[PDB]
């Protein structure tokens, strides 16, 4: 049970799965910064990145592909750099783990 079960009991309290931010992004008055891409579209499509992996930090994935192709097939030689790409995803996950949560707070303040 858990996060689905409360969605059966209190649907107006708990937001749905993979919910977009319904309210204003500037409602919390942080004036929070804008995520700016380092790698643009043409070198994203030059590296044959799939559409499910074109995140806000795809330059680290491009550098991971470059270091994998630099020491192929023994790609563990810069294995920690993989973790670097991984922790960027973790940072994005942390942002997602905030982007849901304050939304529930934004759905609690109106309740």
């Amino acid at each position: 049970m858990g996060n689905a079960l409360t969605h059966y009991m209190k649907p107006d309290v708990m937001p749905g799965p993979d919910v977009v931010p319904t309210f204003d992004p500037l409602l919390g008055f942080k004036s929070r910064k804008e995520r700016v891409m380092i790698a643009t579209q043409e070198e994203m499509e030059s590296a044959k990145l799939p559409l499910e992996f074109r995140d806000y930090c795809a330059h680290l994935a491009i550098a991971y592909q470059a270091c994998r192709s630099d020491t192929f097939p023994f790609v563990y030689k810069c294995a920690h750099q993989k973790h670097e790409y991984l922790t960027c995803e973790y940072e994005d996950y942390v942002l997602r783990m905030k982007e849901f949560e304050r939304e529930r707070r934004l759905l609690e303040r109106q309740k």
């Binding site: 044959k48 192709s69 192929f72 097939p73």
Partner: protein, 49 residues
């Protein structure tokens, strides 16, 4: 096949083919490259078996 084991012949042949296919598979992961060859049999109604 005479004076020899057909199992040993098949064993050495399939280790050689498996090593060749493995070394081909490592080259096809470095480039993310897909090949698709096509041999026509019969064409009718713009559809080719």
């Amino acid at each position: 096949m005479k004076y020899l084991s057909i199992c040993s012949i098949s064993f050495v042949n399939l280790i050689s083919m498996s090593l060749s296919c493995f070394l081909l598979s490592l080259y096809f992961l470095l480039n993310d490259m897909i090949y698709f060859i096509e041999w026509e049999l019969v064409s009718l109604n713009s559809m080719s078996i």
